[PDB]
């Protein structure tokens, strides 16, 4: 009756759905999952088989008395009921020999329900591709039974090395992540098809483990009767869950403490350090609290929503965890970096949005987290901060901390550890967190960030040294935790990279691309009739999946000369050849509006910089171009726009991708066949087009005279359209001509 | 006692000054001149005037030695000879914009330059934005009198720095024909306190 | 309650931790240390120190003001609760709270040039007020020593990249009628308007329903007589001047510094604006 077999059963719950949708037998899919798993390499114990085979209340109210009290599957049944947010008291299970119901239906999307009352409710689907770029297309896709049979063979070949152990839970989870991400949990129903099988299984595993921890701290054993002989509407009122979050504070002021030489590599080092440090502390609280990584709902940029059990054991563990974490931050990053741990008490009605109160979980959590950010120290921290003293302790040159320095270079040690790991992450493959190493992390666990050869030996079944890596070849042999990051280094240097840009001006291009109001879409972008923990999980899953995998795919598939550093809707930071930055911004917009299916938008700012410009000033100036794009509007009273190289050239994505780019391609088409006219004629054209602002009428007349005078060589059609564009939209053709001359320099 | 050294810099040439991170278009001024961030008048920073005066004074007064007659004027923060700076330079803005609109000219011009490669004889045109010549610049340099014994030598040294700056440029592309300034209407007036021997200071300058 | 209104003729640099950046207000640490640097030239350092230490002269930090309006930083109330981004709020309308920009920031790029090695560029972050705009410092019970210490400070400048050349102002000690009875009147939650640090005997009751934000105050001492070396003074973590409280305290003039030739002081007294919430 331990919860490890419970979380394994709750994860392997609804494995019968895929093999019902694939195979030949048409029975109750719960039986199919049960004998599928019992006919594996081991006949797994009854603890798994009652969770897998015996759920779905109609199936277990028939055979009940032979089944035990304290039987560990009733909590799986109620976790499956709560994760859908559905009302499964009367509704049947697919494959109950009822009638003709569908077999091959495609997964929906959480982006079509998103922003329903303004941006409409579309109805798209995810076609199957045999981590492929799968954007939703409105054509009605169907998964053929060979896809499910291939899924069966893949999970058979993966699960053979996987048996119920404490270290196999994350490997089984990432197996579910790789396989069932495009398997719909619902079939032939309402719009419950839009949640994946993996996301619903992760949510029901987290809720099942939390319910068991609540039961084993609040002394409930006869829970079969208070589910079934008396209905559990009284349990739904019980505040049985916590939902905790982290917020890192001061992330931007930390990652932008950069310098002269080795500026950009230090920014990668600090951004990666803070993100993976947040991932490690969010995993380590689950390790101290004896939970799986399914209880994590999201670990994004600077924040980490969890889900726990409302027990005094959990509250005590949270308090003496956050004291140690606060002491470790105030040991090194004195008031600069701080993480805030606040948690609300949440019942079972409001995870279903039953009587309302779903969004108030997030509201109470953010109010408590803002209250923690205000009242962030007790008197002991403040008193020790005031009384704190040291040795000589000069200041870092790249960082600025009054810490003890090191020899021959006279710098901070956080600065130096970030430098050495930044040398290690020039090969971005695998990171190790052991009790000794080069980069300090709490609690007394230092990274080395080694390579895969010395990390194969290092796992001696130590059961404490966690290995984080981005690449997974074989699931069972590795047994490590997967971490997302956007890391496409085209060259890792810019001298040779900007030397092999042939026909343009050798300038760096920097891009920023904030997402327009992802916070508001996170809070109330999804309507109340379709609101549950599954959709709130899978929507953040979808956006993190895009920004940490899909743009890596996009940079790889057409070899754009772009180095990427950040990843997320919070911020992005790409630097590379300016022609590739400008030619990639539009396709990033088009593929973001195809992934989010015209629901979420972006706001980029592009800047042209010289190759040896300070990277801190490059980032600050393109942040100015970013917020110039986010402040874009017409005269009354549209926030998606791109800022090109200067704060006054603010065009929307429609204007850049259509008007500027069609004009530029027409100018490039009509000025490559002529061997004389540009660029002297084009410079004399710009010299009066930019003079229309100060002297309007005479420059328009001189434009007319020049175009009719020298239409003898460029053609009467091109001169007429140059005059008509220069009379209608002058602001656009000036930008098109400027980019054309910058692209044809030398 | 705080004395105010008041005067006026008149430009006998262009005097391009200062640097900006501002973006330049293709046919447009690269390296524009520094301006005030609100009024957009052309501006001489106090740091540029201070550094050029220190450069000329330390070039002349030192003969292969810095001794203290420059550190007492401009300050130092070295390891042992720390001195509080007596002179307090200020950011100088354009004074006679009313004069330039009488002559129907703006406050600044665009100078067109290029370079010729000696191997391929190709030009390389640049546009540098200078202040126009004949624009006055009214400044105020606050002097902090605390050693009444050496105010005579310090104001002699300030006048020597002014008349050494009368023969060199004030900033920017100085060797290639810009930057030439001239000082006029130099006068000293006690701000707080009442200094007795202000006539000898105003006769060191006002001559 | 007199008003030390400051109109600025120059861009100013009030550094926080780096030269490249600048904030728009100077703290009361800077104002007290500036006034006492002006006092040591007059030979009246101890009179000013005992004038502040006996709570006779007590001033806030700088707050922005525009034409006819006086602003203060956003009181971080411990509420149970666009208008989301308003970093400064007026002092007249705070009770009913329960559009704005002054000048712009800039970064004036500079060099240290040399003849026979290449130059060393650096940046100084400025802030230029508008022509109808500046900062004001609240003061209770003005003093002729205070009235003349501002008269020397306007000819030596306030801020960072003084002396070359950024701090230049012209004060007017002014007296107001609708914001002395904002301090005579009282409510139940006491917001802070100075860079205060409660003493160790009252900190644990100062922070009971407090909603603060600690700001570190450090840096190098600015004197040519303190041990003949530009040496950092020990960092003092004070509350921000936009924090609120439930139990009022009184700060102190902390002497931040080890061995040296004179006591390096730091104004960490408080100045509360009691309001009802």
- Closest listed residue to residue C267, CA positions, set C193, C196, C213: C196
- In this complex, the residue of A374, A383, A389 whose CB is nearest that of residue C200 is A383
Say whether residue B21 is in contact with chain A using an 8 A CB cutoff.
yes
Do B19 and A641 form a contact (C-beta atoms < 8 A)?
no
Q: Which of A111, A199, A32 is nearest to A533 (CA)?
A: A199
- How many other C-beta atoms lie within 10 A of the C-beta of residue A567? 24
How many CB atoms are closer than 10 A to CB A391? 6
Q: Which residues contact A47 (CB under 8 A, 6 or more apart)?
A: A1, A2, A5, A6, A9, A72
Report residue A674: phi and psi, to 5°. Answer: -100, 130
**Closest residue by Cα to residue B69 from B139, B166, B161:** B161
CB contact under 8 A, B26 and A645: no
Q: How far is C41 from chain A (nearest CA, A)?
A: 31
Interface contact A683-B21, CB threshold 8 A: no
Distance CA C132, CA C20 (A): 26
B21 Cβ under 8 Å from any chain C Cβ: yes
Phi-psi region of A391 (alpha: psi -120 to 50; beta: other; left: phi over 0): beta
Q: Nearest Cα to C11, choosing from A534, B37, A75?
A: B37
What is d(CA A472, CA A482) in angstroms, rounded to the nearest whole number?
Answer: 8
Tell whether C219 lies on the interface with B, counting CB pairs under 8 A: no
Annotated ligand binding at A633? The verdict is no
Interface test with C, best of B43, B89, B147, B169 (most C CBs within 10 A): B89
Ranges of beta strands (E only) in A68-208 are none
Q: Residue A557 belongs to a domain with what CATH number? A: 3.30.70.270
Q: Domain range for residue A509?
A: 494-658
Q: Does C229 touch chain B (CB under 8 A)?
A: yes
Long-range contacts formed by A650-659: CB under 8 A, 24+ apart:
A651/A732, A651/A735, A653/A586, A653/A589, A653/A601, A653/A602, A655/A732, A656/A585, A656/A586, A657/A586, A657/A589, A657/A590, A659/A729, A659/A732
H runs (alpha helix) in A433-550: 452-458, 475-478, 495-499, 518-524, 533-545
Q: Are C186 and A349 in contact (CB under 8 A)?
A: no
Nearest to B163 by CA among B200, B133, B206: B206
From the number of C-beta atoms within 10 Å of its C-beta (0-12, 13-18, 19+), residue A522 rates as: middle
Place of tokens 């004395």: B3
Joined together, the tokens standing for residue A444 give 């007394």
Residue B47: phi and psi, rounded to 5, are -70, -35
Residue with tokens 């391929």: B120
CB spacing of C163 vs B4 below 8 angstroms: no
CB-nearest to A374 from C212, C218, C234 is C212
C-alpha distance from residue C127 to each of A684, C169, C242 (Å): 39, 13, 21
- A727 known member of a binding site: no
CA–CA distance, A321 with A301 (Å, rounded to integer): 21
Say which residue the tokens 């810009």 belong to. Answer: B178
Q: Is A603 annotated to bind ligand?
A: no
- Determine the Cα–Cα distance for residues A592 and A602; give it in Å rounded to an integer: 8
The HSE-up count of residue C145 (CA atoms within 13 Å, CB side) is 21
Over the Cα atoms of chain C, what is R_g? 19
In this structure, are residues A644 and A682 in contact, taking their beta carbons and an 8 Å threshold?
A: no
**A298 annotated among ligand-binding-site residues:** yes
**Terminal CA-to-CA distance of chain A, rounded, Å?**
75
Structure-block tokens of residue A580:
């590739």
On the question of a cis peptide bond just before residue A679, with omega within 30 degrees of 0, the verdict is: yes
> Given in angstroms, what resolution was this structure solved at?
3.5
Residue recorded with tokens 């704005």: C100
Closest CA to A184 of A124, A139, A241, A118: A124
Instruction: Report the helix count and the strand count for chain B, using DSSP H and E.
Output: 5, 10
The structure tokens 């060099």 sit at C111
C62 strand-pairing partners: C137
Please report which residue ranges of chain B form alpha helices under DSSP H.
46-61, 68-74, 97-100, 151-165, 199-205
In angstroms, what CA-CA distances link C151 with A528, C8, C146? Answer: 65, 14, 9
Contact by Cβ (8 Å): C100, C83: no
Nearest CA-CA partner of A530 in A76, A77, A121, A57: A121
Cα separation, A295 vs A184, whole angstroms: 21
Closest Cα partner for A399 from A216, A499, A253, A527?
A: A253
In this structure, are residues A109 and A194 in contact, taking their beta carbons and an 8 Å threshold? Answer: yes
Strand B2-11 relative to strand B136-144, pairing:
antiparallel
What's the rounded Cα separation, in Å, for the pair C269 and A101? 76
Separation of alpha carbons A564 and A466, rounded Å: 26
A64 CB-contact burial (10 Å; exposed 0-12 / middle 13-18 / buried 19+): middle
CA-only gyration radius of chain A, Å: 29
Residue A630's CB is within 10 A of a number of other CB atoms, namely: 21
Check: CB of residue A189 under 8 Å from CB of residue A104: no
Contact status, residue C137 vs residue C53, Cβ threshold 8 Å: no
Q: How far apart are CA C188 and CA C204, in angstroms?
A: 19
């Amino acid at each position: 009756m331990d919860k490890i077999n419970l979380v394994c059963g709750s994860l392997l719950h609804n494995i019968g759905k895929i093999i019902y949708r694939g195979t030949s037998e048409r029975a109750k899919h719960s039986k199919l999952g049960g004998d599928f798993i019992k006919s594996f390499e081991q006949f797994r114990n009854t603890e798994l088989t009652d969770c897998i085979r015996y759920h779905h209340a109609q199936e277990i109210t028939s055979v009940k008395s032979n089944k035990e009290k304290n039987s560990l599957f009733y909590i799986t049944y109620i976790a499956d009921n709560i994760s859908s947010g559905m009302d499964r008291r009367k509704d049947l299970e697919e494959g109950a020999e009822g009638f003709n119901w569908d077999k091959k239906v495609a997964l929906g999307s959480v982006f079509n329900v998103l922003n329903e009352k303004e941006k409409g409710r579309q109805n798209y689907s995810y076609p199957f591709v045999a981590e492929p770029l799968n954007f939703p297309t409105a054509t009605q896709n169907q998964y053929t039974t060979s896809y499910y049979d291939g899924l069966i063979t893949d999970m058979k070949t993966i699960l053979q090395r996987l048996k119920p152990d404490k270290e196999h839970i994350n490997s089984l989870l990432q197996m579910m992540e790789s396989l069932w991400s495009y398997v719909p949990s619902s079939t032939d129903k309402n719009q419950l098809v839009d949640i994946s099988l993996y996301d619903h299984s992760r949510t029901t595993a987290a809720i099942a483990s939390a319910i068991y921890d609540y039961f084993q701290a609040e002394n409930i054993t006869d829970y079969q009767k208070e589910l079934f002989d008396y209905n559990a509407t009284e349990f739904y009122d019980k505040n049985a869950f916590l939902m905790m979050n982290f917020d890192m504070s001061g992330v931007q002021n930390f990652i932008y403490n950069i310098s002269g030489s080795k500026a950009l590599k230090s920014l990668r080092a600090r951004s990666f350090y803070l993100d993976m440090l947040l991932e490690y502390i969010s995993d380590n609280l689950l390790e101290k609290l004896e939970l799986s990584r399914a209880n994590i709902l999201y670990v994004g940029g600077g924040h980490a929503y969890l889900l726990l059990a409302n027990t005094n054991k959990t509250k005590a563990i949270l308090s003496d965890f956050e004291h140690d974490l606060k002491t470790w931050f105030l040991d090194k990053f004195k008031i600069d970096l701080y993480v805030a741990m606040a948690y609300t008490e949440v019942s079972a009605n409001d995870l279903m949005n039953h009587n309302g109160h779903y969004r108030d979980i997030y509201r109470r959590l953010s109010q408590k987290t803002s209250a923690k950010k205000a009242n962030r120290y007790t008197a002991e921290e403040i008193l020790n901060l005031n009384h704190q003293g040291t040795e000589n302790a000069r200041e870092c040159r790249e960082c600025k901390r009054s810490d003890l320095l090191i020899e021959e270079d006279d710098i901070c040690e956080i600065c130096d550890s970030l430098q050495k790991v930044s040398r290690d992450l020039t090969r971005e493959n695998i990171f190790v967190i052991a009790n000794e190493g080069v980069l300090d992390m709490p609690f007394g666990k230092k990274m080395s960030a080694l390579s895969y050869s010395q990390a194969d030996k290092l796992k001696k079944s130590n059961a404490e040294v966690q290995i984080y890596a981005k690449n997974i070849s074989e699931i069972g042999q590795n047994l490590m935790t997967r971490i997302d990051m956007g890391d496409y280094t085209y060259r890792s240097d810019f001298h040779e990279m900007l030397e092999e840009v042939e026909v343009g001006i050798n300038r760096l291009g920097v891009l920023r691309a904030d997402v327009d109001n992802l916070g508001q879409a996170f809070i109330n972008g999804i309507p109340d009739d379709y609101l549950s923990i599954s959709r709130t999980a899978t929507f953040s899953r979808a956006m993190s999946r895009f920004f940490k995998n899909y743009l890596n795919q996009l940079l790889a598939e057409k070899s754009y000369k772009i180095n990427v550093i950040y990843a997320g809707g919070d911020d992005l930071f790409m630097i590379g050849a300016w022609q590739d930055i400008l030619d990639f911004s539009i396709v990033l917009k088009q593929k973001f509006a195809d992934f989010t299916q015209n629901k979420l938008s972006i706001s980029a700012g592009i800047g042209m910089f010289r190759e040896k410009y300070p990277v801190a000033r490059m980032a600050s100036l393109t942040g100015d171009l970013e917020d110039a794009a986010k402040d874009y509007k017409p005269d009354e009273r549209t926030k998606n726009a791109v800022t090109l190289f200067d704060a006054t050239n603010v065009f929307s994505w429609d204007t850049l991708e259509n008007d500027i780019f069609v004009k530029l391609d027409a100018i490039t088409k009509n000025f490559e066949k002529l061997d004389e006219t540009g660029k002297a004629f084009i410079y004399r054209l710009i010299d009066l087009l930019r003079g229309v602002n100060e002297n309007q009428q005479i420059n328009i007349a001189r434009l007319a005279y020049t175009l009719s005078r020298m239409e003898e060589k460029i053609g009467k059609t091109f001169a007429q359209e140059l005059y008509n564009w220069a009379n209608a939209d002058r602001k656009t053709l000036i930008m098109a001509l400027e980019i054309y001359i910058l692209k044809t320099r030398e | 006692m705080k004395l105010v050294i008041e005067g006026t810099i008149v430009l006998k040439t262009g005097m391009h000054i200062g640097g900006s991170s501002d973006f330049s278009a293709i046919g447009a001024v690269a390296s524009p001149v520094v301006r005030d961030t609100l009024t957009r008048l052309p501006l001489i920073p106090g740091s540029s005037l201070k550094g050029k005066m220190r450069y000329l004074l330390a070039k002349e007064l030192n003969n292969g030695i810095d001794q203290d007659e420059i550190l007492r004027l401009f300050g130092s923060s070295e390891k042992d000879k720390i001195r509080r700076a007596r002179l307090k330079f200020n950011d100088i803005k354009l004074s006679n914009l009313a004069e330039l609109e009488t002559f129907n000219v703006s406050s600044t011009e665009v100078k067109f330059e290029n370079t010729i490669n000696r191997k391929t004889a190709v030009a390389n045109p640049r546009q540098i934005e200078r202040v126009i010549a004949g624009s006055k610049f009214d400044f105020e340099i606050f002097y902090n009198l605390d050693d009444i014994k050496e105010v005579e030598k310090d104001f002699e040294n300030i006048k020597q720095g002014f008349d050494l700056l009368e023969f060199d440029y004030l900033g920017g592309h100085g060797t290639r024909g810009s930057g030439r300034i001239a000082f006029e209407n130099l006068s000293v007036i006690t701000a707080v306190g009442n200094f007795e021997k202000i006539n000898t200071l105003n006769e060191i300058l006002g001559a | 309650m007199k008003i030390i209104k400051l109109y600025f003729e120059s861009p100013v640099h009030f550094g926080e931790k780096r030269l490249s950046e600048s904030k728009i207000t100077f703290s009361a640490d800077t104002l007290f240390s500036a006034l006492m640097i002006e006092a040591v030239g007059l030979g009246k350092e101890d009179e000013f120190y005992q004038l502040a230490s006996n709570n006779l002269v007590k001033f806030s930090d700088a707050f922005p003001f525009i034409d006819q309006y006086y602003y203060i930083p956003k009181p971080m109330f411990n509420l149970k609760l666009a208008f989301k981004k308003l970093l400064y709020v007026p002092i007249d309308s705070l009770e009913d709270y329960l559009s704005f920009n002054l000048g712009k920031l800039a970064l004036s790029e500079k060099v240290q040039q040399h003849d026979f090695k290449d130059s060393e560029p650096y940046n100084v972050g400025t802030f230029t007020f508008k022509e109808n705009t500046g900062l004001y410092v609240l003061i209770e019970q003005t003093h002729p020593l205070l009235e003349e210490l501002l008269e020397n400070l306007q000819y030596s400048g306030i801020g960072g990249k003084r002396n070359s050349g950024y701090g230049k102002f012209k004060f007017e000690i002014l007296e107001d009628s609708d914001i002395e009875d904002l301090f005579s009147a009282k409510g139940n939650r006491k917001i802070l308007l100075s860079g205060a640090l409660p003493k160790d005997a009252e900190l644990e009751q100062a922070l009971k329903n407090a909603s603060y934000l600690l700001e570190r105050r450090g840096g190098f001492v600015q004197s040519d007589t303190y041990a003949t070396n530009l040496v950092k003074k020990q960092d003092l973590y004070v509350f921000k001047s936009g924090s609120t409280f439930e139990n009022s305290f009184d700060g102190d003039i902390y002497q931040v510094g080890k061995k040296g030739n004179h006591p390096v002081y730091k104004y960490a007294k408080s100045f509360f604006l009691e309001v009802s919430v």
